[PDB]
Design a protein around this ligand. Sequence first.
Ligand SMILES: Nc1ncnc2c1ncn2[C@@H]1O[C@H](COP(=O)(O)OP(=O)(O)O)[C@@H](O)[C@H]1O
Ligand SMILES: Nc1ncnc2c1ncn2[C@@H]1O[C@H](COP(=O)(O)OP(=O)(O)O)[C@@H](O)[C@H]1O
Ligand SMILES: [Mg+2]
Ligand SMILES: [Mg+2]
Lengths: 242, 242
Amino acid sequence: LQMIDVHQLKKSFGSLEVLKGINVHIREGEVVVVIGPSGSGKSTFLRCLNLLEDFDEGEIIIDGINLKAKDTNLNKVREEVGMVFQRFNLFPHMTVLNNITLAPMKVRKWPREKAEAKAMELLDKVGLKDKAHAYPDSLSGGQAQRVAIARALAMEPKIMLFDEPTSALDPEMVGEVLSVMKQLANEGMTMVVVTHEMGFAREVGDRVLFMDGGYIIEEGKPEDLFDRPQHERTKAFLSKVF
Amino acid sequence: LQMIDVHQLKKSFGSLEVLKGINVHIREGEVVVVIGPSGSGKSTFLRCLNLLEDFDEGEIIIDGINLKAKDTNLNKVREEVGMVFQRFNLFPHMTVLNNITLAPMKVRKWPREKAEAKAMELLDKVGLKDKAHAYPDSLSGGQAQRVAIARALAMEPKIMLFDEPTSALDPEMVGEVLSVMKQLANEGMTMVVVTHEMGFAREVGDRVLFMDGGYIIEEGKPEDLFDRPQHERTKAFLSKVF
Ligand SMILES: Nc1ncnc2c1ncn2[C@@H]1O[C@H](COP(=O)(O)OP(=O)(O)O)[C@@H](O)[C@H]1O
Ligand SMILES: Nc1ncnc2c1ncn2[C@@H]1O[C@H](COP(=O)(O)OP(=O)(O)O)[C@@H](O)[C@H]1O
Ligand SMILES: [Mg+2]
Ligand SMILES: [Mg+2]
């Protein structure tokens, strides 16, 4: 059972508790959308799942693997989980192609060149094979983020975490990235997607989790949560985004 | 003169020649501003200077070291040349401070205490010592680019390259970045800056090089080239600014 299992997870940056007891159970192939104001721990939660962040209390089990067990191969799980940030996914001094093959070639000891056959692959997947030999400075935000996804997908992960992949793009460039994330969900990928694009949520998401104050205030199918929120706070937040 | 000595530099991508015989010599402490239409070969030129791109013909000599010659320490040239990009630079998984000290420690082999002291020092110099322990996602673009400049300077380079560092920043964020760049030129740093911020050029640059079609078409003091362009192509390009 369960691809992602989180129990009473708590995190504190110094003296401040950022996550105050989070419980989440994500099934394989589920697309969970996380929403909520800024500073409610959305990004911190994702960093814990991708092991970029350590935590205080609770347990985190990635596909049967507890992240804090003695006999755990942590780097096995690190490769297992891919992540796309709102910004800073690409190295500006490297070509799009080399960006995508940097990790597989160096971590997965893989491949030196199935190393780049994989990359040309995904580039066609996101519709930018035509940009293989370009540098990040030539790409639009929309293209750059599509490349960041192809880069995360390059490691062949079972889980894909998106941290507001489009919130830094102007209105007209959001569509192309979301479209790729949609095609990804339709392919059976387990995805935890933090976003404010409540249109993508409805369309692609299985469940939605509304976070606020380091707690998960309410959850439920997009339809039910966006149309019929049950908690006032969920209303107070939705009534200024949807 | 001699900090950057370039002779008959040619570079082609396939049968298309991007740089068609560039000759230029930059003296130590000189601030050279590069302007021109997109596709003119401005980014490629900086990439050859920073060993990010190889070239087909000609000779490039950085601070007396031929990049093509039977083994010069190519890594030492990389060490002395710093570069700032348009689509900026930050490891989203590390704090600002750590982003800055990484190279100083990994490449220059500086002890952690000496590395952080220089980083705190630079952060303060760009008005961001408060962000030291923050992650990049908490920074605005103006702040992120200032962190990327600080990280570049952390290596104590002798040459600082800028490939349109403000071309992707919202207007309200341009000024804080150009300011830092201005303080850099005033303090004596040898700089090469590709930009369309002509105000910065007139104010900081010693010489402006107008590039077009892979050739350096015209050069001159900022005032002279802007107020009285001698070449028709320079005029045609300058006709569209302001
Ligand atoms: N590296 C850090 N150091 C100290 N505090 C942090 C750090 N990262 C995040 N925080 C704080 O933790 C709280 C939640 O952050 P975050 O997970 O990014 O919220 P969200 O991603 O939903 O905007 C905020 O107070 C944020 O400033
Ligand atoms: N890998 C490539 N294949 C084909 N053409 C390229 C490649 N890289 C760059 N070019 C072309 O080289 C020329 C100069 O590019 P560039 O250095 O980015 O100019 P600028 O920085 O002034 O916009 C342009 O025609 C650009 O499209
Ligand atoms: Mg966040
Ligand atoms: Mg350019």
